[PDB]
Each structure stands twice: as structure tokens, then as C-alpha cells.
């Protein structure tokens, strides 16, 4: 449920005894945890929301000029004053201009004048700030079993219902026991800080279009500043790059405005992530986090339930996911009550030889009603399959044949783990989460090493990191004393793998 | 005389967008919108899962696109070494106090 056909999902287990399943919660995929007990659970990060943003310096990219002024002065009488310049609403620059005979100025030679004009502007760039507090995570999770066609479509009553739940997380209130009447308590405690490395992030809204920007880049943009300001005529700062002054070969200086650079800041925005409904409530797309998840109290609701002997029937052609598993929605009337129902698979029967991954443990049916649809899934082994459902003779079976080899499973798992290794960096650790020694060792080694990788190779671009990896390779063959040339090979391969990022 | 060679648009506008989703296996998206060239379209493989229609699932495909209306054309005309024109002025010295264009 809720995590099928959402590829980039994962399945994580926990070696039973001391529920310690710290998942790397994803705002761009789902994660399903399983346990021999403790009905299998999913978690998917719906949205990310920020409550309060502060109004740091704004920017203007659309300006307008008027009431120009030159204020010529003789080659020797000082240089131009132009009382206009007195005001800051005007932008002015002072230029040495030629002044000859038949030009006034009984002398002649290089004189000077101060060309300038009013700086009126429009289309401000509200570059607000946000901080790791009064931001807000909002997730929804779903246990399997009941709830034919889970399917967020009618989520409204599903958080009121038992199979789905909606959770809000604050850096003030990190804990949340996702309580499911009859199912469990789903203990959760997360790190609402180290998700997106906030406090270096600004919420820019330009043309009612919002996004997040690494505040360093936002500080480095050379447009006019509102600079902190509030109401009152905006005294724009630096006021110069926008307008452009130009004299003739020697004389008569004028000014151009260079119009609006809206699309220019767009093409300069080539790394930000866009963001939506903003109100006093600013929502944004993906951003990960670390969530210690505990199976403290999850009762499976119907381990004693009987296996009512009605004949079961498929409805939809149980296609499989990229993760190899396969979901089926099986309907049946014929019996009543809160039923337990069998679901196994085999290679031969007259054995039924229950084999393979059972994901949707304790599949439960609610009521006496007609052919309830009983959505669930299982995962077959690498060969042909025989998924068996009903009970015995009036059961229903079906071929599968996963067609995914065991070494192939390791392939998909390791390339997935490697992509995690890349994008989550340190956080890719404790993903399969037991508090084991080598786990904290990996966390720490990546901590120091990748932090150095940041501070040294600061924000290496696509092309940059590409050629850096290439020349590191070329050098990894050249140098003697493999000890360091192997380190060249290592960093170069790290760089190239970083260039194998999601971009493909 | 300058001739009107290709112009450029740097200010565009988009509207009436279109996606046209298609199942993992039924071909790939058509989107009769794409039929016109006033619309710009690109075809992308998108995920299509269960509870998403499409009794199958896996990588499906859809063609996102929208109308390309634009403004602020760049008239990049051409000129040739003929029907260009030089214009000079010259002046002999002597008379004409304060010559001074």
C-alpha cells in the first residue's frame, strides 16, 4: 500500500530484539519496514513546510529611469555638482568629458560633468530567510493488510481510519507515536535539523515563484539591495550595475536601464529547488531526514483470526515492481467476519512448500460483505512461481516467475545503496539501522572524510568534477609508489561516480 | 538598406500545458497537442505504478508540453558592403574664426 509503483522505494528489516529501525526518511520515495511480528509498515514523506520566514534583503531587476541630468562644468572650475545627486533616489556617476572652444568655458580641455537620473524600479525579489526552527515536516504512513486500493485519493478519512496515519514533526516536538487503534503505536523520533542543512538557505520569491537558495549565492548577487529594508521609499543599494552610463566619443553622456533581468536570474538560478504554496505557509518538495523508528507496541490484530474457507479470485493480473515484488488484489465473497486469509507461494503443490518473501503479513478481511478486494503483495524467488491464495482445493493459484536472479538482486541492491551513498552522503549510513560497531564506524569515517570532501572540493560542478575525475585517473596511472597514486585513483573514481548522479 | 535575416526571441510565455500519460506498455504518449508546432513538447519516461491506473506497471511514458508564445523579438538584420554610405566633412584653415562644427 501507498508505496507500490513509487520506485526508489526500499525494504528494511530489523534483527529482532530491540526495535532500532532508524530509517532515512525520504521526501522522494517510500520505505517499507518488515518484521516477523509487528505488521509490515510503510512510510512516505508527503510534504515539507516552513511556517515563519524573515524578510532579509530584497532585489530589484526591473528598473526605470527618468528626469536625467548632466551638469556640465568647465575644464577648470572644480568638477560638477548637480544638486540632483544630493538625493539617493537618483543614481549618479561622475565623468570627465571633453570641453572645447565654442562650448562656453573660456578655457578648454578635459572638463567634467555628472550624468544621472532617477532610479525607479519594479518587480522586487523577496529573498526571505528561514531557520531550522518553526519549519515543519509532514508525513503519512500506512500498514498493509486491509484497505483495498489504499491509494492516497481519499486520504482524508484514512488518517481517521486504521490503515493510514498522518504525522506532523517539529524541531520542538520530534517524537510522535503513530497510533493505530488495533495495530500499534509506531514510535518515531527524528532529527528535524540535519535534513537540508538549513540556516544557509533562503526562500526566494520573485514573480510569485518560490524556491530555496544557498544563502551564500543569494548574498553574492550584484543587483540593487532593499538590503534589509521595510516600508519607506526603498533606498536601493549599489544602484550601479543595473543602469549603464554612456557618453559620446567625448561628450553628451546619457543612461540606459538594461530593462528587466527576470529570465537572467532564472538562468543564473541553475541549482535552486522550486517551492510552492507560500502564504504564511511555505511548502517545498523533497528533503530527507533521519528517523529513529521503534516497534515498541504493534499488535497484529487477528493472529487468532480463522482462515475462512471461501474461494478467492484474483482481479488484476498481479504485475510486479522494479523491486521484484508483486502485488495482487484478490476479491472474494462467500464467507464473513474479520477473516485471516492464507497467502503463500511454491514451485510445486501437493506440497504448497511455503517459500519466498511474504511482505503483507497477516492479511485481514473486515466484513461479511461481498467480494472484498483484499489488496496485498508478495515477492517470489528468482525462478518460476506458483502464488497460492485461497486455502486448499477451492483455492486460486497463478504462475509468476519473477525472472530476477539472486546475483541480480545484489546488483540492484548495491547500485541502489551506492546512489544512496552518493546523494545522502553520511546519512546513507544507519539506513539499515542497527547500532552495530561498524555502523557507527562507517558513519564516522564518512563524517570526517566527506566533510573534508566538501570543504576541499567545495560544490564541484558537473563539468568541473568530470574533468577533475578524468585527470585524477590519468595521474593514477602515471605516478610511482601506488600508495598515493592509488589515492588519486580513489578520489578520481569518487568524482566520476558523483558524476553518475541522478542526473542520468 | 538592411535585409531581415533570422530574428530571435528571448522573452517567451507558456500556457495551456499538457502531459498525456501512458501506461508502461501501450506504446508511448501521443498528445494530439504535440501535432502543432506553436506548442513545444518533449517526451519523457515517467514512473507508473499500481493505484495509478495501468493494470501493469513500471516505467511508463508521457509527453509534457505547452504553447510557446513569445515577445521582444531580436531583429538581427543584415547589411552588405554596398548601399552603405560614408559621410565626412573637411575644412581648410585660414579664415572662419571659430570654425567649430
Amino acid at each position: 500500500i501507498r508505496c507500490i509503483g513509487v520506485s526508489n522505494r526500499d525494504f528494511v528489516e530489523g534483527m529482532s530484539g530491540g526495535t532500532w529501525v532508524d530509517v532515512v526518511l525520504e521526501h522522494g520515495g517510500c520505505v517499507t519496514v518488515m518484521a516477523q511480528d509487528k505488521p509490515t509498515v510503510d512510510i512516505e514523506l508527503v510534504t515539507t513546510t516552513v511556517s515563519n520566514m524573515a524578510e532579509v534583503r530584497s532585489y530589484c531587476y526591473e528598473a526605470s529611469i527618468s528626469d536625467m541630468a548632466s551638469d556640465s562644468r568647465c575644464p577648470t572650475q572644480g568638477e560638477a555638482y548637480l544638486d540632483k545627486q544630493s538625493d539617493t533616489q537618483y543614481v549618479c556617476k561622475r565623468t570627465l568629458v571633453d570641453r572645447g572652444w565654442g562650448n562656453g568655458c573660456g578655457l578648454f580641455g578635459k572638463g567634467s560633468l555628472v550624468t544621472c537620473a532617477k532610479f525607479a524600479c519594479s518587480k522586487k525579489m523577496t529573498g526571505k530567510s528561514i531557520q531550522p526552527e518553526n519549519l515543519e515536516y509532514r508525513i503519512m504512513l500506512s500498514v498493509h493488510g486491509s484497505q483495498h486500493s489504499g491509494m492516497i485519493v481519499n486520504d482524508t478519512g484514512h488518517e481517521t481510519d486504521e490503515n493510514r496515519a498522518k504525522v506532523e514533526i517539529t524541531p520542538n516536538s520530534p517524537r510522535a507515536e503513530a497510533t493505530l487503534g488495533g495495530f500499534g503505536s509506531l514510535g518515531l523520533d527524528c532529527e528535524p535539523r540535519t535534513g537540508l542543512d538549513f540556516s544557509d538557505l533562503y526562500y526566494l520569491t520573485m514573480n510569485n515563484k518560490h524556491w530555496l537558495v544557498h544563502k551564500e549565492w543569494f548574498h553574492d548577487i550584484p543587483l540593487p539591495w532593499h538590503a534589509g529594508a521595510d516600508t519607506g521609499t526603498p533606498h536601493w543599494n549599489n544602484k550601479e550595475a543595473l543602469v549603464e552610463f554612456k557618453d559620446a566619443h567625448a561628450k553628451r553622456q546619457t543612461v540606459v536601464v538594461l530593462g528587466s533581468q527576470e529570465g537572467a536570474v532564472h538562468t543564473a538560478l541553475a541549482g535552486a529547488l522550486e517551492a510552492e504554496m507560500d502564504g504564511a505557509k511555505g511548502r517545498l518538495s523533497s528533503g530527507h531526514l533521519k528517523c529513529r523508528l521503534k516497534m515498541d507496541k504493534l499488535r497484529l490484530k487477528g493472529v487468532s483470526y480463522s482462515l475462512c474457507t471461501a474461494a478467492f479470485t484474483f482481479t488484476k493480473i498481479p504485475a510486479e515492481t522494479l523491486h521484484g515484488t508483486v502485488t495482487v488484489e484478490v476479491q472474494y465473497a462467500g464467507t464473513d467476519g474479520p477473516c485471516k486469509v492464507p497467502a503463500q507461494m511454491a514451485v510445486d503443490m501437493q506440497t504448497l512448500t511455503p517459500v519466498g518473501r511474504l511482505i503483507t503479513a497477516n492479511p485481514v478481511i473486515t466484513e461479511s460483505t461481498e467480494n472484498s478486494k483484499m489488496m496485498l503483495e508478495l515477492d517470489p524467488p528468482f525462478g518460476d512461481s506458483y502464488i497460492v491464495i485461497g486455502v486448499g482445493e477451492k483455492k486460486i493459484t497463478h504462475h509468476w516467475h519473477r525472472s530476477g536472479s539472486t546475483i541480480g538482486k545484489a546488483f540492484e541492491a548495491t547500485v541502489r545503496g551506492a546512489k544512496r551513498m552518493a546523494v545522502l552522503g553520511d546519512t546513507a549510513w544507519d539506513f539499515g539501522s542497527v547500532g552495530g560497531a561498524l555502523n557507527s564506524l562507517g558513519k564516522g569515517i564518512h563524517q570526517i572524510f566527506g566533510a573534508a570532501f566538501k570543504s576541499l572540493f567545495g560544490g564541484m560542478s558537473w563539468f568541473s568534477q568530470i574533468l577533475i575525475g578524468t585527470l585524477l585517473m590519468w595521474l593514477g596511472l602515471n605516478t610511482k609508489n601506488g600508495s598515493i597514486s592509488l589515492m588519486c585513483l580513489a578520489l578520481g573514481g569518487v568524482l566520476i561516480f558523483l558524476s553518475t548522479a541522478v542526473s542520468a | 538598406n538592411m535585409a531581415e535575416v533570422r530574428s530571435y526571441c528571448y522573452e517567451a510565455s507558456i500556457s495551456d500545458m499538457a502531459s498525456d500519460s501512458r501506461c508502461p506498455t501501450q506504446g508511448e504518449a501521443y498528445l494530439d497537442k504535440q501535432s502543432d508546432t506553436q506548442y513545444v513538447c518533449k517526451r519523457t519516461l515517467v514512473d507508473r505504478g499500481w493505484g495509478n491506473g495501468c493494470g501493469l506497471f513500471g516505467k511508463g511514458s508521457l509527453v509534457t508540453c505547452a504553447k510557446f508564445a513569445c515577445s521582444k523579438k531580436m531583429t538581427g538584420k543584415s547589411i552588405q558592403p554596398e548601399n552603405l554610405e560614408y559621410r565626412i566633412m573637411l575644412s581648410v584653415h585660414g579664415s572662419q574664426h571659430s570654425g567649430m562644427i
Epitope: - | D16, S19, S21, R22, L31, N52, G53, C54, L62
Partner: antibody, heavy 132, light 107 residues
């Protein structure tokens, strides 16, 4: 309350194009495939085509290939049908209807249907006559 | 490819009678069949989805059945509001067709 409404009856020139509107009420406009179905005065019903209010996806039958266009209008929650190159058979009544699990953008009939397959908001029927 | 015959062409019966209509298609339409009745100048009447299912609000006066290719609708007891043209139509393969009709008349 879930309910569809058509435009008034109309009369057009042979070879012209007629556009009938269909406005929805009582439901989220992006959750129901709009089916158009024709009915000549003495003839039965014959399904014309389908559009999805979301994304403006379209399809029809060969009896109208090249004349039928079907567009969305998400703002007022409406769908607009144009018949082009009108012909003497076009004098009929056309119906628009909401349909099933309109998940993305299609007909999508291998999965389930029914529960007013397309029959809750059959509206009022758009009478069109084609002559001079 | 979607040819569906709907028999008979017409009928007329007294009040309180059972009537049945048949529709057989040239194709396999396992359960994707539906039934309406429409007056002249009316939106049709809620009758049947999936050829076996009564819709909410529909009187139990109506029933539908049939599995493979041919399907039977039945009015249990005729009533004055049953005058209409009845239609059966498939849902699959998407050249969606209907029946030409089954017309009623009270005696």
C-alpha cells in the same frame, strides 16, 4: 451535488464547426473522464469519444477522426467539444458524462468501472441541428 | 468488432408483467456490460452496471444477468414509469457501441 450541464441547443451550417460546453458540479473536476456520446433523433446511442478534464487527454472513434476536438478548461471546470466539417448526420443530441477512476489521463478500462460508470451526470442533452 | 445485437426490437405488455431483454455481442465482454432506459427528451434511467449489479436508488423491480457473451435484463413487474427505450452497451476495447433499442408500451 454531482451534476453536469450542457449549453443550449444550436443550429449550424453544413461544413461549419459547433462547440458545445459541459460544466460540472459537485465533484473535483479532475477526477472523472468526460465521455461524449451522440444520439440521432430516431437512432440509438453511439459513443463519440472521451477526454480527461486533467491534462486535456483525448480519444474518439473513427466515425469522427479529423473532425472532433475536445478540450479542457480547468478554471470553470468545463469541457468543450468541437465538431468540424458538419454533415447532415450531425443533427442529433450529444451527451457529456463523468466517468470512473480518472486517475491520470486516459480511458483506462482494463481496470474497474461502474458505480455510475458514466451515468451520474448525464446532464440535459445538447440538441444540434445542421442546415441552412 | 463490437457488434452487439439487442433483442427484441420492441415489446408491449400489461402492468405487473415480467419482461426480459437479451443482448449478445460477437465478442467476449466478460462483465463490462451496462443497461439504461431513456424516455424521449430524458436523461436515461439508472438500471444496471456490470450487467449484474443494481445501483443505489434503483428499484429492485429490475435485474440483470449473463456471463459470457449474451446477457438478460428483466423487469419483475411492469409499471407506468417503465415506458422508455432500453439500451444495453459494452465497455471494453473502446469502440464503445450501444444497442439500437428495446421499446416499451403499456396496454
Amino acid at each position: 451535488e454531482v451534476q453536469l450541464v450542457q449549453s443550449g441547443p444550436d443550429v449550424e451550417k453544413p461544413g461549419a464547426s459547433v462547440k458545445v460546453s459541459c460544466k460540472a458540479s459537485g465533484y473535483t473536476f479532475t477526477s472523472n473522464y468526460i465521455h461524449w456520446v451522440r444520439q440521432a433523433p430516431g437512432q440509438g446511442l453511439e459513443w463519440m469519444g472521451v477526454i480527461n478534464p486533467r491534462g486535456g487527454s483525448t480519444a474518439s472513434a473513427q466515425k469522427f477522426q479529423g473532425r472532433i476536438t475536445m478540450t479542457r478548461d480547468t478554471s470553470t471546470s468545463t469541457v468543450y467539444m468541437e465538431l468540424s466539417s458538419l454533415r447532415s448526420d450531425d443533427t442529433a443530441v450529444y451527451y457529456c458524462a463523468r466517468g470512473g477512476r480518472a486517475l491520470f489521463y486516459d480511458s483506462y478500462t482494463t481496470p474497474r468501472d461502474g458505480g455510475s460508470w458514466w451515468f451520474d451526470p448525464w446532464g440535459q442533452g445538447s440538441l444540434v441541428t445542421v442546415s441552412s | 468488432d463490437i457488434q452487439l445485437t439487442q433483442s427484441p426490437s420492441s415489446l408491449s405488455a400489461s402492468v405487473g408483467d415480467r419482461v426480459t431483454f437479451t443482448c449478445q455481442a460477437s465478442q467476449d465482454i466478460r462483465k463490462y456490460l451496462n443497461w439504461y432506459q431513456q424516455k424521449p427528451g430524458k436523461a436515461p434511467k439508472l438500471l444496471i452496471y456490470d450487467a449484474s449489479n443494481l445501483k443505489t436508488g434503483v428499484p429492485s423491480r429490475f435485474s440483470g444477468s449473463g456471463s459470457g457473451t449474451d446477457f438478460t435484463f428483466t423487469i419483475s413487474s411492469l409499471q407506468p414509469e417503465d415506458v422508455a427505450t432500453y439500451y444495453c452497451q459494452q465497455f471494453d476495447d473502446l469502440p464503445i457501441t450501444f444497442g439500437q433499442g428495446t421499446r416499451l408500451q403499456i396496454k
